[PDB]
Amino acid sequence: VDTCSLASPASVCRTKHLHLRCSVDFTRRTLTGTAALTVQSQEDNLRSLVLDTKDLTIEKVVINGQEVKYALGERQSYKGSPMEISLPIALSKNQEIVIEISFETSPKSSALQWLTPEQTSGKEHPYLFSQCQAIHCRAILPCQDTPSVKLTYTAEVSVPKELVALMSAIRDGETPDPEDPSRKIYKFIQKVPIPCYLIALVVGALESRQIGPRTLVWSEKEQVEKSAYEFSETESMLKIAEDLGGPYVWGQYDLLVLPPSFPYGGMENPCLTFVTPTLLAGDKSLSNVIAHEISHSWTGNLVTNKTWDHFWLNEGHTVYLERHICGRLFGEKFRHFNALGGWGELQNSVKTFGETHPFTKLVVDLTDIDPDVAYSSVPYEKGFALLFYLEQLLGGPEIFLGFLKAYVEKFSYKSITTDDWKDFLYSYFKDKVDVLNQVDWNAWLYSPGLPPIKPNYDMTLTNACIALSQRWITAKEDDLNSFNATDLKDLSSHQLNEFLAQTLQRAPLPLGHIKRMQEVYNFNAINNSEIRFRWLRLCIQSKWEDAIPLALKMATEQGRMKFTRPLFKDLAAFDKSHDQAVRTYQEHKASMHPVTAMLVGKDLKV
Ligand SMILES: NCc1ccc(-c2cccs2)s1
Ligand SMILES: [Yb+3]
Ligand SMILES: [Zn+2]
């Protein structure tokens, strides 16, 4: 059962379909309309059901063309308010009914960010985007806000006519709005049953360019050309993901490039992946994020975590396929390079939280925990580490990829637990149960800290990062002269980034050393967001005051929480930048993403 949802569980009733008819009111910052839920009973004599809501205004509820009784319970913090509906007629098991809810969103909907024209690229039009994962769909429309339920959906969205609506669904036509000629209705169908966290919407001055046989890239006109180039490997990645996971079932694979305040690297919304513009490095070097979102079309979107306690299933498998696509594009040594990097990221997470912290568990218990608060690299990297370990245990990538294909096959269109996964692992590897019984299951799955066993990693690409980093850490003042631009001449951007990651793990370094890095390596000039992030962190942690404006600038000019949160934290911990950091947040707080705002607030203790 889903301790993050207040709705009737899948064993009571099931949403089969949503028809959403709504208007986007930019002047009031509200979404207004009707959510018509097709619900199938799972019980005999069913007379009421409960739905999640969060900051919604319910006008009325209609069943069989008549209003029915409903009530909203007390707010339970981040979980929202439960809405109990009284059914006009007892249902028997498997009976279906349509329930039509008239509702309106609040401007503070934790699902939405409303952008004024000045917050956009074009400076002429406002912009709306949604982010439902994990439990924010309830802040757009009443629903069983649990990934244990999969529904199809259709939608009609009315918007000022000069703007474009897109959703996680096949685009199904536009027409002027018969109730308002200043408006267009855009229509959408999603024929593949999805968890409701995969529902997404964007409204803005959007344009598109085709980059492959089944891919259009979407953004404001100012980002289109750059985006078309950054993501040109997309078709290639799909073909590799199709080869590894099986047929791509979703029709198209489009990309939406969001304004800079999108809180994540990516969101695997079906048909329309959302990405940060912080990927636009100009050389495709951050394309692993595309590989990841593509991979989700199997791991996460076909096979879905039953509850957020099993989030690792979504993330760990997706990181595993991601790394396989990049290994195919750039070679097995590179797969190992990124795998070993990921391990480093896991050391960081475990060290940040504390080696005994509950959030360092692979399977977590989210009872009274806000999933946004619990979110970290753990399910990603501990998840991946288990799978890489098992890969090496059970006889290599080729063998384990067979299990991955069979696993997707076996659980398509379903929602599963860690036990469902493990049961199927044992079934599939029935001739290797003696080997699988060597795995410390309780530790891997249920204990905090780093995993009991570290996988084996090829070192070829990593060595030169470690060596350079060791030169800087162990350098004294009379060694600083020996450093030079030519040190970097054989390192790709991935290696520079790993070099900085290596060095960041022993930060602070002496201030003199950092100043010298700037002198010889001119890291200030790199706009690769991953490199710049780690470099600015190293500067602030080593107490370089020159870096304070640069860090404040990055933290606020984009809002990818991966970058913004640790930047603000670093600035707060540094005494010279503390007050400015707090001030800056307080100034930007109202125009930030509502989730980013909330979490940065918690990080800063404000
Ligand atoms: N898949 C990209 C994501 C965006 C937000 C996510 C969360 C998962 C659990 C709590 S927040 S996962
Ligand atoms: Yb010396
Ligand atoms: Zn993911």
UniProtKB/Swiss-Prot annotation:
The active site is at E293 (proton acceptor), Y380 (proton donor). Binds 1 zinc ion per subunit. One of its GO terms (cellular component) is ficolin-1-rich granule lumen. The modification Phosphoserine is found at S412. Isoform 1 and isoform 2 are expressed in monocytes, lymphocytes, neutrophils, reticulocytes, platelets and fibroblasts. Zn(2+) binds at H292, H296, E315. It is found in: Cytoplasm. Inhibited by bestatin. The epoxide hydrolase activity is restrained by suicide inactivation that involves binding of LTA4 to Tyr-375. 4-(4-benzylphenyl)thiazol-2-amine (ARM1) selectively inhibits the epoxide hydrolase activity. The record marks D372 as: Essential for epoxide hydrolase activity, but not for aminopeptidase activity. The modification N6-acetyllysine is found at K69, K333, K410, K569. Changing H292Y: Complete loss of LTA4 hydrolase and peptidase enzyme activities. Pathway: Lipid metabolism; leukotriene B4 biosynthesis. Changing G266A: No loss of activity. This is Leukotriene A-4 hydrolase. It comes from Homo sapiens. The lineage of its organism: Eukaryota, Metazoa, Chordata, Craniata, Vertebrata.
